[PDB]
Amino acid sequence: ELQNRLAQYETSLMVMSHNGDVPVITGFNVMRVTTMLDALKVPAVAVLGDDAQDLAYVFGARPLAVGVNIIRVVDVPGQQPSALVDAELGALHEVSMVRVLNDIADEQLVKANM
Amino acid sequence: ELQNRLAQYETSLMVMSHNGDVPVITGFNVMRVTTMLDALKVPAVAVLGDDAQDLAYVFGARPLAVGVNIIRVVDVPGQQPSALVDAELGALHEVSMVRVLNDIADEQLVKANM
Numbered sequence A, B: 001e002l003q004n005r006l007a008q009y010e011t012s013l014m015v016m017s018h019n020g021d022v023p024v025i026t027g028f029n030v031m032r033v034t035t036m037l038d039a040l041k042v043p044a045v046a047v048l049g050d051d052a053q054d055l056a057y058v059f060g061a062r063p064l065a066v067g068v069n070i071i072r073v074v075d076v077p078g079q080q081p082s083a084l085v086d087a088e089l090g091a092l093h094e095v096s097m098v099r100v101l102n103d104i105a106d107e108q109l110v111k112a113n114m
Helices: A002-010 A050-061 A083-088 A097-113 B002-010 B050-061 B083-088 B097-113
Strands: A012-017 A029-032 A044-048 A069-074 A094-096 B012-017 B029-032 B044-048 B069-074 B094-096
Touching (some): A002 A012, A002 A069, A002 A097, A012 A097, A050 A083, B002 B012, B002 B069, B002 B097, B012 B097, B044 B050, B050 B083
Parallel strands (some): A012 A044, A012 A069, A029 A044, B012 B044, B029 B044, B069 B094
16 A cells, blocks of 8 residues: 555665666656765665666665665656666666656645645 | 875774674774665774675675775774675775774874974
8 A cells, every 4th residue: 555655665765777867856856876875865866877887786786785775766757777787786676666756746635635 | 194094094984894792992983784874874983793794795895886985994902803794805905993093193192282
């Protein structure tokens, strides 16, 4: 249900496979990174491209070393996925950014209506 | 020479292989961790034991994903190394904590003498 969805967005780091200029995403700090300190530094969307080969590997193969839940996002308008990152993150379930944004926007209407 | 040594201590995270209660180390925040967020959270000595199998692996095999220099320390009084962590961090050169402390203490005498 929605509350639980938002609760998990709230405490996770979104991760986006993408090479090229970074997108603007409503309500999210967006930032290209290649290390966890930079990721742990940025609601945020950490953008990973080919140059983040090692970090992608860690997120995909050594999840418990991170210390924060990672959510792999797709369907970001303009997204140009890195095949390397996608492969590295294969064990992570792709979540649509559109659905994420929808939920947050919808909950905001609720909040504005109180 | 000493200044360069201290400069690198200053900007690195010390990592200690050890199972058991954590030590007290003069001038250092000491803390057992198993994830990078907790490590990146702690001058600090991050203590890794068997339960930090994945994080140790990352430090030892995917250094570039970390975002901060890691210095593997040994000769900490009372240290009881984890064979797993030691193996995982094998590519990291063991540095004696005694030498590290010596340097910092010696530089402090200099500073106190000005």
